Amino acid sequence: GSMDCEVNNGSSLRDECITNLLVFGFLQSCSDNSFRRELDALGHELPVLAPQWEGYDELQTDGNRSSHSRLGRIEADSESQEDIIRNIARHLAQVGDSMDRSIPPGLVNGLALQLRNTSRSEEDRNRDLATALEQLLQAYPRDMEKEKTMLVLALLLAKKVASHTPSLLRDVFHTTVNFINQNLRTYVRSLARNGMD
């Protein structure tokens, strides 16, 4: 019985390309334009190992070729998963921004002060949100799952600072994509599924 006789092949969930995507879009609308080139540089070092890249051939891939006549009439196709998760993030992330414009009593700042943490961020941040999370959650009954409330918050925290401090993007990007990948990974997939929550 069972399937453990030499044959060890079935499936493997290895599509992080989405997690990173989310944060992009998320942090993309976080402050709208006037800070694009910045994000463009982010993805310039935010790749994904993945099972492979393009070992098949060594030539080109014959892309679209020539200019790109989109006229913004191609972003409303919501056909390719990538196109969906993208439009979904910028959307939910859009609403959150409008409601964020009115940052509460000096909040983002601190988050930016906690995230900032020079190069400690990745670490200082991780233990920052993770600690700040369980902290606020420490009063909020769990039992079910912290993912949602935990991420919804912590996640928002990061993307938040980004708004106040657009010089921590990268740091923020991972903020929502890291703390999760640690264990709540499967959650981010939701970040897109719902756009925000």
Side-chain angles (χ1 to χ4, degrees), residues 142-188:
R142 30 152 179 170
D143 180 355
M144 177 197 189
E145 285 302 350
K146 272 111 113 207
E147 326 209 5
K148 238 111 92 158
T149 16
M150 199 141 106
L151 282 0
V152 174
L153 257 188
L155 297 213
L156 262 53
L157 308 197
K159 318 212 259 309
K160 243 141 179 101
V161 2
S163 130
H164 210 283
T165 316
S167 219
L168 266 172
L169 277 152
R170 24 167 30 76
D171 241 337
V172 201
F173 270 51
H174 303 316
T175 305
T176 291
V177 175
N178 239 342
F179 180 68
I180 316 308
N181 277 213
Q182 285 262 290
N183 332 256
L184 286 30
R185 221 142 61 160
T186 338
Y187 178 84
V188 189

Side-chain angles (χ1 to χ4, degrees), residues 2-3 5 16 18 27 35 45 49 60 67 76 89 107 111 115 122 128 134 140 144 149 151 164-165 171 173 180:
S2 215
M3 278 161 86
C5 194
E16 307 137 33
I18 69 84
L27 288 306
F35 246 108
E45 251 266 333
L49 188 116
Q60 231 114 43
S67 328
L107 185 143
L111 239 292
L115 239 176
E122 303 157 70
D128 253 323
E134 245 155 84
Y140 316 163
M144 177 197 189
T149 16
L151 282 0
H164 210 283
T165 316
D171 241 337
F173 270 51
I180 316 308

